[PDB]
């Protein structure tokens, strides 16, 4: 299957070169809008914290299949354990706004409070990296405040990404990265 290698043209030779016969390969579990919809957990701050999709850790399943796409657009969902009267300002409101009750305010109801808030930002599509590391102020979804935020979760809806970026696996010291696996 010799072909000019210095051409960046994909060349995927198959098993039928020496008698093989490719079975059918169905890929549902690896879609980009099916794998991101899973409530990744972020380290929650004190009373006031902002809804930025980048404060999620870089080693989770949602945080690491997101820092593999330069640009992304996705509606949002949260589910917080507020000890109070959590409110939510839109993107760009003066940070003194999240003290008024006219803004969308959920009252306490044990145990969680699950919200589905839209995507509000001037830019047509956000970005993970930015060639101005600090990103601009405009890149966020809004800011919530309560008396004491206890938990916080992110679940992107309708996610769609562009311009892929490298993914890195853990580097093992041995020849093979062995570890435990569940066994009866």
């Amino acid at each position: 299957t010799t072909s000019t290698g210095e051409s960046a043209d994909p060349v995927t030779t198959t098993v039928e070169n020496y008698g093989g016969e490719t079975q059918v390969q169905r890929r549902h579990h690896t879609d980009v809008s099916f794998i991101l919809d899973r409530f990744v957990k972020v380290t929650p701050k004190d009373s006031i914290n902002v809804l930025d999709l980048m404060q999620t850790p870089s080693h989770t399943l949602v945080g690491a299949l997101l820092r593999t796409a330069t640009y992304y657009f996705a509606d949002l969902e949260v589910a917080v354990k507020h000890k109070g009267d959590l409110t939510w300002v839109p993107n760009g409101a003066p940070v003194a706004a999240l003290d008024n009750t006219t803004n969308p305010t959920a009252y306490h109801k044990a145990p969680l409070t699950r919200l589905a808030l839209p995507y509000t930002a001037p830019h047509r599509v956000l970005a993970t990296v930015y060639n101005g590391r600090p990103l601009p102020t405009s890149f966020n979804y809004g800011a919530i405040k309560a008396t004491r935020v206890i938990e916080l979760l992110y679940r992107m809806k309708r996610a769609e990404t562009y311009c892929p970026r490298p993914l890195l696996a853990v580097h093992p010291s041995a020849a093979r990265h062995k570890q435990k696996i569940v066994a009866p």
């Binding site: 010799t2 072909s3 995927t12 070169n17």
Partner: peptide
């Protein structure tokens, strides 16, 4: 992925 050349050269 569909543009991928796969035949013998």
């Amino acid at each position: 992925a569909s543009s991928a050349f796969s035949g013998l050269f």
